[PDB]
Every structure is written in structure tokens, then in C-alpha cells.
Amino acid sequence: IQFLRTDDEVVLQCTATIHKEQQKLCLAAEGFGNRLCFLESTSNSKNVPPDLSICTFVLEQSLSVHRTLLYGHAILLRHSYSGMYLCCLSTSKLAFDVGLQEDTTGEACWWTIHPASKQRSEGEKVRVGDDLILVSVSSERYLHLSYGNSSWHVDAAFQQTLWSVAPISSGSEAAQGYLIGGDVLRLLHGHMDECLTVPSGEHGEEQRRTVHYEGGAVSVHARSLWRLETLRVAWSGSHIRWGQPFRLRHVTTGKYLSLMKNLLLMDKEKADVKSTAFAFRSSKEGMGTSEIKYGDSICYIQHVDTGLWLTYQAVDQRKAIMHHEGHMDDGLNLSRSQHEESRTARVIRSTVFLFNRFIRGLDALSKIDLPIESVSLSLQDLIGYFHPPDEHLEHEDKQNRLRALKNRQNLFQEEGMINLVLECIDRLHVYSSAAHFADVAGREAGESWKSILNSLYELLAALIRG
Numbered sequence: 273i274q275f276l277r278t279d280d281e282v283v284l285q286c287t288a289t290i291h292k293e294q295q296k297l298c299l300a301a302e303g304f305g306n307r308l309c310f311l312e313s314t315s316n317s318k319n320v321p322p323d324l325s326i327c328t329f330v331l332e333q334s335l336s337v338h339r340t341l342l343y344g345h346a347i348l349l350r351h352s353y354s355g356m357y358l359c360c361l362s363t364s365k366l367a368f369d370v371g372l373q374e375d376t377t378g379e380a381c382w383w384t385i386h387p388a389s390k391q392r393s394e395g396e397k398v399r400v401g402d403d404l405i406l407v408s409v410s411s412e413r414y415l416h417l418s419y420g421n422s423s424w425h426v427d428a429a430f431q432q433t434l435w436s437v438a439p440i441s442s443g444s445e446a447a448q449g450y451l452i453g454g455d456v457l458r459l460l461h462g463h464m465d466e467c468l469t470v471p472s473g474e475h476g477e478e479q480r481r482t483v484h485y486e487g488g489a490v491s492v493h494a495r496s497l498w499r500l501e502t503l504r505v506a507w508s509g510s511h512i513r514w515g516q517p518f519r520l521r522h523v524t525t526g527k528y529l530s531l532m533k534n535l536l537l538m539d540k541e542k543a544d545v546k547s548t549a550f551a552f553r554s555s556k557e558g559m560g561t562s563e564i565k566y567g568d569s570i571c572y573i574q575h576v577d578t579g580l581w582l583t584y585q586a587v588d589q590r591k592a593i594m595h596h597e598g599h600m601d602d603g604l605n606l607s608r609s610q611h612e613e614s615r616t617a618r619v620i621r622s623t624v625f626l627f628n629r630f631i632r633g634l635d636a637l638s639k640i641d642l643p644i645e646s647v648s649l650s651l652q653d654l655i656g657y658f659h660p661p662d663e664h665l666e667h668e669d670k671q672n673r674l675r676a677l678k679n680r681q682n683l684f685q686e687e688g689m690i691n692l693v694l695e696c697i698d699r700l701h702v703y704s705s706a707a708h709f710a711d712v713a714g715r716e717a718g719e720s721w722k723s724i725l726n727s728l729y730e731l732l733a734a735l736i737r738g
């Protein structure tokens with residue numbers, strides 16, 4: 273019998289009917305270059321890793337119209353992946369869109385939580401696994417599941433939907449300094465000043481699939497970051513314990529470490545459990561108990577189905593391999609990502625995915641998925657992400673912004689983002705004018721041609737300034 277408290281992380285699931293069968297869908301959002309919520313499916317986890325990291329929300333506040341949630345309370349839900357708040361938007365006949373926004377002033381980001389049956393009443397504690405009803409303070413509409421364009425989406429409507437709150441992590445009970453599921457980290461041979469990583473971004477996607485240990489500067493770059501993802505939905509943000517199975521997702525490429533018997537990163541669609549499940553071991557011989565400490569624990573990675581140890585091949589850069597014995601100095605030292613670099617790494621991966629789409633759509637025009645709107649909003653968010661701190665800020669706020677900015681520029685540059693922006697610009701410069709682009713790509717494309725180009729130049733300037 274457990275209760276929800278503020279600083280708890282949850283996923284919000286509703287039941288939908290797909291292929292004539294009941295399935296649980298998680299509320300999700302991305303937030304980078306798109307604000308609208310969508311639904312993420314949790315099925316076939318034995319063959320395809322669910323993507324919990326976009327579904328995960330933190331119960332930031334809970335107030336009467338760490339504190340225990342009560343029925344009738346208004347709550348503020350921070351999306352973990354982006355840092356923005358779930359809200360009832362003022363766009364969409366009588367439904368509003370639901371999505372993320374930065375600003376929590378006003379009522380739009382607040383939701384009152386209500387019993388699904390007479391089994392609960394106003395002012396009682398909300399239990400883990402009670403079905404909730406959520407109502408928008410600003411619009412009086414329910415957070416709602418709707419069926420539209422042969423597809424399920426989330427809106428705010430005057431029809432109810434029941435949401436289950438699955439507990440993920442309970443921030444009030446995370447031991448600080450310990451490995452928790454969903455964490456973004458680096459895996460180091462401390463004595464060697466080396467970390468687990470993949471080839472740099474001057475290599476093509478295929479080459480980027482191979483895994484090795486590398487010393488020097490890469491230990492502060494995006495491509496050494498991995499997210500540890502447990503096999504569970506409920507309590508997927510618990511303390512990680514020795515021998516507990518997980519997957520390791522490479523943040524920069526979005527791919528999953530897998531055993532073929534070579535090591536190779538795989539698309540989520542090929543990332544089955546026998547081939548991708550690993551565990552930490554302390555030797556080679558609810559939240560639950562905290563057991564693996566950042567910095568201090570020496571960790572050995574084992575492939576679960578084979579029992580083989582993740583190790584290195586001595587140079588006769590050390591390739592990463594699996595072997596039944598490995599090396600006496602295999603032991604991995606774990607280091608937790610800062611929130612800044614982790615977010616920048618993710619932002620880079622969405623940008624590269626979206627801009628590659630845009631480039632392919634441009635190439636297909638000259639020989640369609642051409643996401644003009646998302647590219648427009650991506651670029652405005654990226655320009656905001658590189659905004660110089662306003663001269664009116666306090667000293668410490670300014671210094672802090674400037675340090676973050678240098679880190680953001682460095683991570684972007686090292687992933688090749690300057691060349692990517694330059695390729696977008698070259699593809700757009702093939703057109704003589706906005707009207708010429710419109711003739712080929714449509715009126716809406718033509719009316720964003722100049723604005724997209726100006727934002728790409730502005731972004732480029734931000735990527736190299738002092």
C-alpha cells in the first residue's frame with residue numbers, strides 16, 4: 273500500500289483497443305521542435321524496447337483548490353525528457369490540444385485529480401495503481417484519449433478517460449550517489465582514462481555501430497553517454513541492484529548495445545531481450561536497496577543470456593568484445609551525466625534525425641516527407657538554446673549561462689552539427705527564390721524558405737561564437 277508524493281516520477285497510461293485487443297498506452301511528448309503530446313505503446317517489450325524516457329513525468333506540485341497526493345488536489349507535471357509542463361493548450365470541435373509549455377503561470381498547466389469510482393473520495397490519499405481522472409483547471413476538460421485518422425491521440429475533451437499512474441522512480445527515496453534505472457551515464461576504465469563509446473560523427477551510420485573504449489576528450493562529449501533502461505515499466509527508475517537485467521541505449525545514435533558473437537548497436541526494432549540484456553556484477557566469481565555507487569563501485573558487465581563478460585581487446589583503440597574470462601582490469605567505474613550534457617545529447621540526436629529527414633525530402637524534390645513546420649520550430653528552439661545571456665541578468669546567472677553555452681556549443685560541434693547545418697543551407701540555396709521553392713514544394717514550404725534559411729544562418733553563427 274503505497275501513495276504518490278511530490279518529486280515522484282510516473283507514467284500515465286490509458287487503455288486503448290488495438291488489433292481488437294486491449295493495450296496500455298503511455299502519455300508522451302518530445303518537446304524539442306514539437307510541443308504536442310502523443311501516445312507511446314508498451315507492447316512486445318521482449319522484442320522491442322519501449323521508449324520510456326519520453327513518457328516519464330515528475331509530480332512537481334500538488335495543492336488544494338515532498339507532499340502526499342490527495343484526491344481533489346491540483347498538480348503540476350514536469351515532463352522529464354524536455355523540462356516543460358503538461359498543459360492544456362489553446363489550439364486544436366470542443367476539444368483542446370494537450371502538450372508541453374515552459375510557463376507555469378496561469379491555470380493551463382494545472383490538473384485536478386479525481387476518483388475513478390466511489391471507492392475513493394476528495395481528500396483521500398492517491399494510491400499507486402488507482403485509476404485517476406484528470407481535469408484541466410483552465411479548460412474544465414478531461415485529459416482524454418481520442419480515436420482519429422485511424423489512430424489514437426490525447427486531447428482535453430468533455431469525455432472522460434481513466435488513467436493509471438504507474439510509479440517509475442520516487443525521488444524522495446533515491447539514495448544520492450547511486451545508480452537508478454533510466455540514468456544517463458558514462459562507463460570508464462578509471463586507471464586507463466578511457467570510456468565506452470562509438471566512432472565519431474565523421475563516420476557513417478554503419479561504422480558508428482561498433483563499440484570501443486577511448487581515452488582523451490571523448491569522456492566529455494555526447495557520444496560517450498549511455499542510458500541504462502531496465503526491463504520493467506513499473507519501478508524502472510528504482511535503484512539498480514547487482515545482477516538486475518537492463519539494456520544500454522547509446523544516447524547519440526539512439527541504438528541499443530547488442531550481442532550478434534560480436535558487439536553491435538541495433539535499431540530498437542531488432543533489439544530483442546536475449547541479445548540486449550546485460551547486468552552489473554560486483555565480481556566475476558519499490559525503489560529497493562541502493563547497491564551500485566557512482567565513482568566507487570567497480571562494476572563488471574555480463575551479458576545475461578550468455579554469461580559472457582564485457583571486456584576489451586588489447587591493441588596487438590581497444591575494441592569492446594565479450595569473452596568468458598576477460599581481463600583482471602575490466603572493472604568499470606560509473607560516472608553520472610550532468611543534466612546539461614544529457615539534455616544537449618538528446619537535442620542533438622532529435623535534430624540530426626529531423627534534419628536528415630528534411631535533407632532527404634529536399635533531395636527527393638530535386639530527383640515526400642518534407643517537415644517544414646517541425647524544422648521551423650526546431651530552429652527557433654535551437655536559437656533559444658544558444659541565446660546569449662541578456663545583459664540585464666545578475667552576474668552569477670550570466671556566468672552560469674555562458675558556461676552552459678560553451679558546453680552546448682562544444683557538444684554540438686563534436687557531433688558534426690556545423691556540417692549538418694551547412695548541408696541544410698546548401699540544399700535550400702539550390703532554389704533561386706521563395707517562389708521557385710514554392711513552385712516545387714508547395715506554398716507553405718515557399719513561405720518558410722527565407723525564414724528557415726535565416727534561422728539556419730543564425731544558428732550557424734551561434735555554433736561558432738566566442
Ligand SMILES: [Cl-]
Binds near residue numbers: 325499521523618
Ligand atoms: Cl536517450
